[PDB]
Amino acid sequence: ARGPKKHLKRVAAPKHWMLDKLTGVFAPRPSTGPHKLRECLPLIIFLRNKLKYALTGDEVKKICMQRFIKIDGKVRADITYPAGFMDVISIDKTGENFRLIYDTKGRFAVHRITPEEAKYKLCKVRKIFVGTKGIPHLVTHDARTIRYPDPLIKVNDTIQIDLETGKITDFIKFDTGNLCMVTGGANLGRIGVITNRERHPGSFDVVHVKDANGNSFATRLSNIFVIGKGNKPWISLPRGKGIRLTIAEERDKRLAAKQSSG
Amino acid sequence: GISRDNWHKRRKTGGKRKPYHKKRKYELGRPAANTKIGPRRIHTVRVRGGNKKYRALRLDVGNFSWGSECCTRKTRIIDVVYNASNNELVRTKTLVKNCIVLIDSTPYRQWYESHYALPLGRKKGAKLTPEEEEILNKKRSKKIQKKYDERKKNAKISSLLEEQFQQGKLLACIASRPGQCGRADGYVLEGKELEFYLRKIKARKG
Amino acid sequence: RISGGNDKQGFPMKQGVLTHGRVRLLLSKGHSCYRPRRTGERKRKSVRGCIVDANLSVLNLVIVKKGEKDIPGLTDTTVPRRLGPKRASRIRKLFNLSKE
Amino acid sequence: DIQTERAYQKQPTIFQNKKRVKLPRYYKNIGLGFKTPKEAIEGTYIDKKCPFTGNVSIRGRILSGVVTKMKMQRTIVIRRDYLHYIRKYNRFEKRHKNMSVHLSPCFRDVQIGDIVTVGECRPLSKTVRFNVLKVTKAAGTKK
Amino acid sequence: KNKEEAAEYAKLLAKRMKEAKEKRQEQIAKRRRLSSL
RNA sequence: GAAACUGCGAAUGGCUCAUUAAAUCAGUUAUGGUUCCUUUGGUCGCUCGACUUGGAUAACUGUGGUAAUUCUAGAGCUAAUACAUGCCGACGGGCGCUGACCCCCUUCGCGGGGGGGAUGCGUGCAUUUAUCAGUGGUGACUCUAGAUAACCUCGGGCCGAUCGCACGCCCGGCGGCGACGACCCAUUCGAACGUCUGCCCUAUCAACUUUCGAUGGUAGUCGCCGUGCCUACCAUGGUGACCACGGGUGACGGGGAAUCAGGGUUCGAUUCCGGAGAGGGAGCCUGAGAAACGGCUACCACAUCCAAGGAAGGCAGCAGGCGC
């Protein structure tokens, strides 16, 4: 390497894209954007592989160059634009709106939302900051810089922003007894209520989360997103509601629905 | 060219490293600025990330600070006296960071007189005959004079400083890398620093 | 005026080299007798010296002052201006126009 | 006593020429529950590389060896012992790795055999990357 | 935009500082409570 | 709409394994010790002092050179988001010193207490230095903001002399979508140098390293930054039977592969990740990123074309030829 790399081989592509082997050598290396390369869903992948609207990368090119698809209330004419967590994908001509939040397993589900819910999103604040005139500053998980915020919002809270104005409406404080979706590690997509936070000065602080059915699991603080106050999520969830039942239970449910079909 | 790398020199144990790759660029290195005292001359070096880096090859002026009362003025460097690292950097008087220089005491004196309304240096029997110095030292209203008599209380200068002022040249220490920023900025020596360095200059001198 | 021709091997006379022989220069962008292919490219070019001498093949000459007599070849005619001013200020400057 | 080197030794943050009519000291607690010891606050020594009265931040690892040598200038060699486990023979082997570590004149008397806790800092010299943060006197050593 | 953002922050902040000052007088109320409960 | 100028890319991809034995590399952590084109989001009347400026060049036209190449000299013509040069605005003040002068109340009176305030100088962010105070944050800042006194590289930081669609809203009035550009900030892509532990055979390798850097201290230099990286002056140190130092490898490392009762032994040039190299060494231009080789400049080895003066090289890219 003598500079930045531009090709991403299909075997090196993040596993949650569920890309087949015998299609090609390469996968779409996501163009730089708000979310990380590893943890996004490129617009070509979501449009062609998941929705099956297009068949080839040229067909996706033909769609995205007619200004149809709108990511977070702005038109994105880049077929490998990184669409990541909490992002709101509205297609106007079809009349359909998707919020990219995780399946109960470590992948992105294709969760349809209503016109009135596809008008805002939840942003995890990353670092608070003072500018060049004692003007306070936020930085969120999706690279948004919000200045003149509410003077109580701190480094691990969640803010609800509007996708026209880009201004803070209401916020959920990071407390014990607040709903959190886990957005990294083994427990990727698990929804549960924060039970404890265990402080380790110099190391990564681990946070205990309780599922609805009394399933207790820990995650590092970085891989947690407060998505609701109490047991009330301020968004709509996929079918499953983030439980991640065992493989024996998933089998039982599968062949239950199978034998019921007959 | 001039390499700045660890792999060219022996391990902790005295064992030789065989270099596993040729010289890279980011392991860079350029010739020394060697800033002399003369008419302003600054060359520009384009560095990593496309940023700039100014090579002062000659300098006359410099932004020096009398620290005890926050009186900083652009003065004129005259010469160098003592350098802690090497004494050939005195002979071929190079301007490097933390070398002792002499500066023109005139802007500090001018401020001192215009602030306190008291004379500095100006030896006993000084013919102040232009007498706009007497304007700066006299002729006020009532309450303004009360403010000036209030202030002249705490204008007791250190004798070590007052000699240098009367001689007409002050000792200063260069606080900025002149070969990299193109500036000979510093602070005027005072107190225990000044007594330390005045001993060191006299002792070396002999 | 001696506008500067070529050597008898085609190595053109570069300005201000101040010799009567043939020498090698490392020519970069913004020079004579050279144009780079890539940006920041430099090249060794064999160029003939500036001093006009016996052993050339050509001399480029430009008629500084037109003399007493008239030549059959050149002065007789005059080629037209292919193009004129494209910039608004250059039009106003040439044809002497008021602002309004 | 101090100022043995040719350049004037001072804590460069504190200003010691304030006109008037004791010298002040700059220090810091370096986090992770380490008591900024008494000699740091009430000493008159100067050190760039003291974690208390200097410009080094402790971050990364916190290791511990036994003091082996104290024969170099404001630096000591600690000896770190561990058991490396060979897999074929279900047994261990006794290994060691001794590192040059920076000792502040803050810790006034350490004896070879004393137990040290070291915090990772930036590279201080060619081989020095760790700083002595607390000393625990070896078994007994009262008399 | 710079003027209106500054004005709306001045309202919201001054309200939050009045909340903290109501707490400041409870801090002194806790002092006098430890003094004479 | 050819050509040409400008902008971007050519640092990725591909090929091979010669080097290289705490090196590479793997897991684990650090940047509170750095640089970063592009993207996404902030900023961009925050500064108190022109209804559009300037002189060159290409393609083009024409005149030529030597045998020769992606060689190019000379003349005349013309452009810019190339290259330079620069207002007006908002703009009336505000703040900080300076400070004529002024009126007021008290001491009969001086003195005292506070008020207004002419003239002048300074002002924004970034940049370099010195001093003072302690809005938000960290396990911890010499952090971030704030205050005062100056600076400001002539090889020069910013503070739009730019382009396209829609055409509008009242008495020659009067503004929305975009493209392009930019000092700084965060973000994304990284890169870079560090932390801890880990490697094959060898004693017919037992001592090794250092006054021309070997291990440390102080102050510099240089670099994107931390550091003997390198200067100068000091100190006598660093490593070793727990195998240092030296030598060998038909040694690039790992994920892995073959064989297997349970242990294990052998392989891993080879499509994924990381590294190194472009015939052998060395040096650099341009750029955000190169010590680049389908870039340039030397020398060593080889080697093509010569009107004999000179010109041009680099298959461990895809095919293919000789040799082996």
PDB file of N, CA and C in Angstrom, chain A residues 70-140:
ATOM      1  N   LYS A  70     -34.241   8.631  -1.451  1.00  0.00           N
ATOM      2  CA  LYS A  70     -33.932   9.760  -0.532  1.00  0.00           C
ATOM      3  C   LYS A  70     -33.533   9.192   0.838  1.00  0.00           C
ATOM      4  N   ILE A  71     -32.244   9.284   1.188  1.00  0.00           N
ATOM      5  CA  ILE A  71     -31.665   8.805   2.481  1.00  0.00           C
ATOM      6  C   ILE A  71     -31.598   9.993   3.449  1.00  0.00           C
ATOM      7  N   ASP A  72     -32.363   9.931   4.546  1.00  0.00           N
ATOM      8  CA  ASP A  72     -32.437  10.961   5.618  1.00  0.00           C
ATOM      9  C   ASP A  72     -32.872  12.307   5.015  1.00  0.00           C
ATOM     10  N   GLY A  73     -33.905  12.287   4.164  1.00  0.00           N
ATOM     11  CA  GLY A  73     -34.539  13.481   3.570  1.00  0.00           C
ATOM     12  C   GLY A  73     -33.607  14.276   2.667  1.00  0.00           C
ATOM     13  N   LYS A  74     -32.651  13.612   2.004  1.00  0.00           N
ATOM     14  CA  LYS A  74     -31.749  14.216   0.981  1.00  0.00           C
ATOM     15  C   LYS A  74     -31.440  13.176  -0.102  1.00  0.00           C
ATOM     16  N   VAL A  75     -31.469  13.594  -1.371  1.00  0.00           N
ATOM     17  CA  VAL A  75     -31.259  12.715  -2.560  1.00  0.00           C
ATOM     18  C   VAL A  75     -29.774  12.340  -2.630  1.00  0.00           C
ATOM     19  N   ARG A  76     -29.494  11.047  -2.820  1.00  0.00           N
ATOM     20  CA  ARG A  76     -28.134  10.447  -2.788  1.00  0.00           C
ATOM     21  C   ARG A  76     -27.906   9.675  -4.092  1.00  0.00           C
ATOM     22  N   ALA A  77     -27.305  10.337  -5.089  1.00  0.00           N
ATOM     23  CA  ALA A  77     -26.981   9.779  -6.431  1.00  0.00           C
ATOM     24  C   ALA A  77     -25.580   9.150  -6.391  1.00  0.00           C
ATOM     25  N   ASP A  78     -25.349   8.257  -5.424  1.00  0.00           N
ATOM     26  CA  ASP A  78     -24.107   7.454  -5.263  1.00  0.00           C
ATOM     27  C   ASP A  78     -24.531   6.047  -4.826  1.00  0.00           C
ATOM     28  N   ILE A  79     -24.357   5.056  -5.706  1.00  0.00           N
ATOM     29  CA  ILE A  79     -24.983   3.703  -5.589  1.00  0.00           C
ATOM     30  C   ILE A  79     -24.320   2.919  -4.446  1.00  0.00           C
ATOM     31  N   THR A  80     -23.095   3.296  -4.054  1.00  0.00           N
ATOM     32  CA  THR A  80     -22.343   2.717  -2.909  1.00  0.00           C
ATOM     33  C   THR A  80     -22.230   3.755  -1.782  1.00  0.00           C
ATOM     34  N   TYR A  81     -23.291   4.533  -1.527  1.00  0.00           N
ATOM     35  CA  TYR A  81     -23.385   5.446  -0.357  1.00  0.00           C
ATOM     36  C   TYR A  81     -23.669   4.603   0.885  1.00  0.00           C
ATOM     37  N   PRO A  82     -22.895   4.759   1.985  1.00  0.00           N
ATOM     38  CA  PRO A  82     -23.097   3.954   3.189  1.00  0.00           C
ATOM     39  C   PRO A  82     -24.347   4.386   3.972  1.00  0.00           C
ATOM     40  N   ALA A  83     -25.434   3.620   3.827  1.00  0.00           N
ATOM     41  CA  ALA A  83     -26.670   3.706   4.641  1.00  0.00           C
ATOM     42  C   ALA A  83     -26.532   2.751   5.831  1.00  0.00           C
ATOM     43  N   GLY A  84     -26.464   3.291   7.053  1.00  0.00           N
ATOM     44  CA  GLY A  84     -26.136   2.541   8.283  1.00  0.00           C
ATOM     45  C   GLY A  84     -27.312   2.465   9.240  1.00  0.00           C
ATOM     46  N   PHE A  85     -27.029   2.435  10.547  1.00  0.00           N
ATOM     47  CA  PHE A  85     -28.026   2.222  11.629  1.00  0.00           C
ATOM     48  C   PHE A  85     -28.920   3.463  11.766  1.00  0.00           C
ATOM     49  N   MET A  86     -30.210   3.243  12.058  1.00  0.00           N
ATOM     50  CA  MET A  86     -31.264   4.268  12.319  1.00  0.00           C
ATOM     51  C   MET A  86     -31.596   5.101  11.067  1.00  0.00           C
ATOM     52  N   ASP A  87     -30.898   4.907   9.939  1.00  0.00           N
ATOM     53  CA  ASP A  87     -31.035   5.750   8.719  1.00  0.00           C
ATOM     54  C   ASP A  87     -32.391   5.478   8.061  1.00  0.00           C
ATOM     55  N   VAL A  88     -33.008   6.534   7.519  1.00  0.00           N
ATOM     56  CA  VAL A  88     -34.410   6.559   7.007  1.00  0.00           C
ATOM     57  C   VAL A  88     -34.365   6.675   5.478  1.00  0.00           C
ATOM     58  N   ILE A  89     -34.707   5.591   4.772  1.00  0.00           N
ATOM     59  CA  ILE A  89     -34.651   5.474   3.284  1.00  0.00           C
ATOM     60  C   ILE A  89     -36.082   5.551   2.738  1.00  0.00           C
ATOM     61  N   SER A  90     -36.460   6.712   2.188  1.00  0.00           N
ATOM     62  CA  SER A  90     -37.803   7.019   1.628  1.00  0.00           C
ATOM     63  C   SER A  90     -37.731   7.043   0.097  1.00  0.00           C
ATOM     64  N   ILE A  91     -38.493   6.165  -0.566  1.00  0.00           N
ATOM     65  CA  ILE A  91     -38.670   6.122  -2.049  1.00  0.00           C
ATOM     66  C   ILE A  91     -40.081   6.645  -2.356  1.00  0.00           C
ATOM     67  N   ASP A  92     -40.176   7.790  -3.040  1.00  0.00           N
ATOM     68  CA  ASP A  92     -41.418   8.602  -3.168  1.00  0.00           C
ATOM     69  C   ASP A  92     -42.343   8.013  -4.242  1.00  0.00           C
ATOM     70  N   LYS A  93     -41.803   7.642  -5.410  1.00  0.00           N
ATOM     71  CA  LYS A  93     -42.594   7.164  -6.582  1.00  0.00           C
ATOM     72  C   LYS A  93     -43.295   5.839  -6.249  1.00  0.00           C
ATOM     73  N   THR A  94     -42.663   4.983  -5.439  1.00  0.00           N
ATOM     74  CA  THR A  94     -43.228   3.696  -4.946  1.00  0.00           C
ATOM     75  C   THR A  94     -44.138   3.962  -3.737  1.00  0.00           C
ATOM     76  N   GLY A  95     -43.810   4.973  -2.925  1.00  0.00           N
ATOM     77  CA  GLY A  95     -44.559   5.348  -1.709  1.00  0.00           C
ATOM     78  C   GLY A  95     -44.248   4.402  -0.564  1.00  0.00           C
ATOM     79  N   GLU A  96     -42.955   4.206  -0.279  1.00  0.00           N
ATOM     80  CA  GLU A  96     -42.434   3.250   0.737  1.00  0.00           C
ATOM     81  C   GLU A  96     -41.276   3.897   1.506  1.00  0.00           C
ATOM     82  N   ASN A  97     -41.194   3.616   2.811  1.00  0.00           N
ATOM     83  CA  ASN A  97     -40.199   4.188   3.760  1.00  0.00           C
ATOM     84  C   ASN A  97     -39.637   3.059   4.631  1.00  0.00           C
ATOM     85  N   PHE A  98     -38.308   2.917   4.679  1.00  0.00           N
ATOM     86  CA  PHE A  98     -37.577   1.894   5.474  1.00  0.00           C
ATOM     87  C   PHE A  98     -36.666   2.587   6.493  1.00  0.00           C
ATOM     88  N   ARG A  99     -36.618   2.065   7.723  1.00  0.00           N
ATOM     89  CA  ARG A  99     -35.601   2.416   8.753  1.00  0.00           C
ATOM     90  C   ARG A  99     -34.671   1.216   8.940  1.00  0.00           C
ATOM     91  N   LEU A 100     -33.380   1.392   8.645  1.00  0.00           N
ATOM     92  CA  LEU A 100     -32.338   0.346   8.820  1.00  0.00           C
ATOM     93  C   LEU A 100     -31.995   0.226  10.309  1.00  0.00           C
ATOM     94  N   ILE A 101     -32.734  -0.623  11.032  1.00  0.00           N
ATOM     95  CA  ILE A 101     -32.352  -1.140  12.380  1.00  0.00           C
ATOM     96  C   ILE A 101     -32.208  -2.661  12.274  1.00  0.00           C
ATOM     97  N   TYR A 102     -31.371  -3.243  13.135  1.00  0.00           N
ATOM     98  CA  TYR A 102     -30.866  -4.636  13.029  1.00  0.00           C
ATOM     99  C   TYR A 102     -32.004  -5.643  13.233  1.00  0.00           C
ATOM    100  N   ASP A 103     -31.941  -6.753  12.490  1.00  0.00           N
ATOM    101  CA  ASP A 103     -32.646  -8.028  12.793  1.00  0.00           C
ATOM    102  C   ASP A 103     -32.155  -8.510  14.165  1.00  0.00           C
ATOM    103  N   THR A 104     -32.860  -9.460  14.785  1.00  0.00           N
ATOM    104  CA  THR A 104     -32.481 -10.074  16.090  1.00  0.00           C
ATOM    105  C   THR A 104     -31.120 -10.779  15.958  1.00  0.00           C
ATOM    106  N   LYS A 105     -30.801 -11.307  14.769  1.00  0.00           N
ATOM    107  CA  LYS A 105     -29.452 -11.818  14.395  1.00  0.00           C
ATOM    108  C   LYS A 105     -28.603 -10.659  13.860  1.00  0.00           C
ATOM    109  N   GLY A 106     -27.286 -10.858  13.761  1.00  0.00           N
ATOM    110  CA  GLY A 106     -26.314  -9.802  13.413  1.00  0.00           C
ATOM    111  C   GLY A 106     -26.384  -9.407  11.947  1.00  0.00           C
ATOM    112  N   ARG A 107     -27.513  -8.832  11.512  1.00  0.00           N
ATOM    113  CA  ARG A 107     -27.716  -8.290  10.139  1.00  0.00           C
ATOM    114  C   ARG A 107     -28.778  -7.184  10.163  1.00  0.00           C
ATOM    115  N   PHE A 108     -28.878  -6.436   9.061  1.00  0.00           N
ATOM    116  CA  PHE A 108     -29.904  -5.388   8.825  1.00  0.00           C
ATOM    117  C   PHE A 108     -31.170  -6.038   8.258  1.00  0.00           C
ATOM    118  N   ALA A 109     -32.292  -5.886   8.969  1.00  0.00           N
ATOM    119  CA  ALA A 109     -33.653  -6.222   8.493  1.00  0.00           C
ATOM    120  C   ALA A 109     -34.160  -5.078   7.607  1.00  0.00           C
ATOM    121  N   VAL A 110     -35.166  -5.358   6.771  1.00  0.00           N
ATOM    122  CA  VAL A 110     -35.806  -4.370   5.849  1.00  0.00           C
ATOM    123  C   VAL A 110     -37.175  -3.991   6.435  1.00  0.00           C
ATOM    124  N   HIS A 111     -37.156  -3.094   7.425  1.00  0.00           N
ATOM    125  CA  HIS A 111     -38.311  -2.733   8.292  1.00  0.00           C
ATOM    126  C   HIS A 111     -39.028  -1.504   7.718  1.00  0.00           C
ATOM    127  N   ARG A 112     -40.210  -1.707   7.123  1.00  0.00           N
ATOM    128  CA  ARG A 112     -41.072  -0.629   6.565  1.00  0.00           C
ATOM    129  C   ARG A 112     -41.660   0.198   7.713  1.00  0.00           C
ATOM    130  N   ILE A 113     -41.756   1.519   7.525  1.00  0.00           N
ATOM    131  CA  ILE A 113     -42.324   2.493   8.508  1.00  0.00           C
ATOM    132  C   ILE A 113     -43.353   3.379   7.794  1.00  0.00           C
ATOM    133  N   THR A 114     -44.148   4.121   8.569  1.00  0.00           N
ATOM    134  CA  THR A 114     -45.263   4.979   8.079  1.00  0.00           C
ATOM    135  C   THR A 114     -44.677   6.308   7.600  1.00  0.00           C
ATOM    136  N   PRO A 115     -45.382   7.076   6.731  1.00  0.00           N
ATOM    137  CA  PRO A 115     -44.934   8.415   6.335  1.00  0.00           C
ATOM    138  C   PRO A 115     -44.593   9.369   7.494  1.00  0.00           C
ATOM    139  N   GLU A 116     -45.320   9.271   8.614  1.00  0.00           N
ATOM    140  CA  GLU A 116     -45.208  10.193   9.777  1.00  0.00           C
ATOM    141  C   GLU A 116     -44.039   9.783  10.687  1.00  0.00           C
ATOM    142  N   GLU A 117     -43.645   8.502  10.687  1.00  0.00           N
ATOM    143  CA  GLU A 117     -42.498   7.975  11.482  1.00  0.00           C
ATOM    144  C   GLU A 117     -41.184   8.171  10.710  1.00  0.00           C
ATOM    145  N   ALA A 118     -41.231   8.194   9.370  1.00  0.00           N
ATOM    146  CA  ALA A 118     -40.059   8.378   8.476  1.00  0.00           C
ATOM    147  C   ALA A 118     -39.707   9.867   8.323  1.00  0.00           C
ATOM    148  N   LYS A 119     -40.025  10.703   9.322  1.00  0.00           N
ATOM    149  CA  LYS A 119     -39.776  12.172   9.324  1.00  0.00           C
ATOM    150  C   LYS A 119     -38.687  12.549  10.343  1.00  0.00           C
ATOM    151  N   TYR A 120     -38.329  11.647  11.267  1.00  0.00           N
ATOM    152  CA  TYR A 120     -37.275  11.849  12.299  1.00  0.00           C
ATOM    153  C   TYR A 120     -36.386  10.602  12.383  1.00  0.00           C
ATOM    154  N   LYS A 121     -35.334  10.673  13.206  1.00  0.00           N
ATOM    155  CA  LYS A 121     -34.480   9.514  13.580  1.00  0.00           C
ATOM    156  C   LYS A 121     -33.823   9.771  14.940  1.00  0.00           C
ATOM    157  N   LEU A 122     -33.419   8.692  15.616  1.00  0.00           N
ATOM    158  CA  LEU A 122     -32.658   8.724  16.893  1.00  0.00           C
ATOM    159  C   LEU A 122     -31.164   8.726  16.564  1.00  0.00           C
ATOM    160  N   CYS A 123     -30.414   9.684  17.118  1.00  0.00           N
ATOM    161  CA  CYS A 123     -28.939   9.804  16.980  1.00  0.00           C
ATOM    162  C   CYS A 123     -28.287   9.653  18.358  1.00  0.00           C
ATOM    163  N   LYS A 124     -27.355   8.705  18.494  1.00  0.00           N
ATOM    164  CA  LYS A 124     -26.488   8.546  19.693  1.00  0.00           C
ATOM    165  C   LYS A 124     -25.403   9.627  19.641  1.00  0.00           C
ATOM    166  N   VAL A 125     -25.394  10.531  20.624  1.00  0.00           N
ATOM    167  CA  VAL A 125     -24.338  11.576  20.795  1.00  0.00           C
ATOM    168  C   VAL A 125     -23.017  10.864  21.121  1.00  0.00           C
ATOM    169  N   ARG A 126     -21.910  11.312  20.516  1.00  0.00           N
ATOM    170  CA  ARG A 126     -20.568  10.660  20.570  1.00  0.00           C
ATOM    171  C   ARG A 126     -19.602  11.492  21.422  1.00  0.00           C
ATOM    172  N   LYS A 127     -19.588  12.816  21.235  1.00  0.00           N
ATOM    173  CA  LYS A 127     -18.757  13.766  22.025  1.00  0.00           C
ATOM    174  C   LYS A 127     -19.432  15.142  22.053  1.00  0.00           C
ATOM    175  N   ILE A 128     -19.641  15.694  23.254  1.00  0.00           N
ATOM    176  CA  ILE A 128     -20.015  17.124  23.470  1.00  0.00           C
ATOM    177  C   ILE A 128     -18.715  17.934  23.512  1.00  0.00           C
ATOM    178  N   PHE A 129     -18.808  19.248  23.293  1.00  0.00           N
ATOM    179  CA  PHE A 129     -17.695  20.095  22.789  1.00  0.00           C
ATOM    180  C   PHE A 129     -18.117  21.567  22.852  1.00  0.00           C
ATOM    181  N   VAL A 130     -17.168  22.483  23.078  1.00  0.00           N
ATOM    182  CA  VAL A 130     -17.386  23.962  22.995  1.00  0.00           C
ATOM    183  C   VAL A 130     -16.562  24.496  21.817  1.00  0.00           C
ATOM    184  N   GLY A 131     -17.172  25.355  20.991  1.00  0.00           N
ATOM    185  CA  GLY A 131     -16.605  25.861  19.725  1.00  0.00           C
ATOM    186  C   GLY A 131     -15.574  26.952  19.953  1.00  0.00           C
ATOM    187  N   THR A 132     -15.733  28.102  19.289  1.00  0.00           N
ATOM    188  CA  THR A 132     -14.746  29.220  19.262  1.00  0.00           C
ATOM    189  C   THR A 132     -15.341  30.499  19.873  1.00  0.00           C
ATOM    190  N   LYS A 133     -16.474  30.406  20.584  1.00  0.00           N
ATOM    191  CA  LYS A 133     -17.131  31.555  21.274  1.00  0.00           C
ATOM    192  C   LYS A 133     -17.950  31.056  22.478  1.00  0.00           C
ATOM    193  N   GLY A 134     -17.501  29.978  23.133  1.00  0.00           N
ATOM    194  CA  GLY A 134     -18.272  29.242  24.155  1.00  0.00           C
ATOM    195  C   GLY A 134     -19.610  28.756  23.621  1.00  0.00           C
ATOM    196  N   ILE A 135     -19.665  28.412  22.328  1.00  0.00           N
ATOM    197  CA  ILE A 135     -20.860  27.842  21.637  1.00  0.00           C
ATOM    198  C   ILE A 135     -20.776  26.327  21.803  1.00  0.00           C
ATOM    199  N   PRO A 136     -21.651  25.674  22.607  1.00  0.00           N
ATOM    200  CA  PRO A 136     -21.587  24.223  22.774  1.00  0.00           C
ATOM    201  C   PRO A 136     -21.885  23.478  21.463  1.00  0.00           C
ATOM    202  N   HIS A 137     -21.276  22.301  21.304  1.00  0.00           N
ATOM    203  CA  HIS A 137     -21.299  21.460  20.079  1.00  0.00           C
ATOM    204  C   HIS A 137     -21.586  20.006  20.462  1.00  0.00           C
ATOM    205  N   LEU A 138     -22.409  19.323  19.663  1.00  0.00           N
ATOM    206  CA  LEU A 138     -22.609  17.850  19.696  1.00  0.00           C
ATOM    207  C   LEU A 138     -21.949  17.240  18.458  1.00  0.00           C
ATOM    208  N   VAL A 139     -21.519  15.982  18.571  1.00  0.00           N
ATOM    209  CA  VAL A 139     -21.212  15.075  17.427  1.00  0.00           C
ATOM    210  C   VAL A 139     -21.979  13.775  17.683  1.00  0.00           C
ATOM    211  N   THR A 140     -22.745  13.305  16.695  1.00  0.00           N
ATOM    212  CA  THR A 140     -23.635  12.119  16.803  1.00  0.00           C
ATOM    213  C   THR A 140     -22.945  10.910  16.156  1.00  0.00           C
TER     214      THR A 140
END
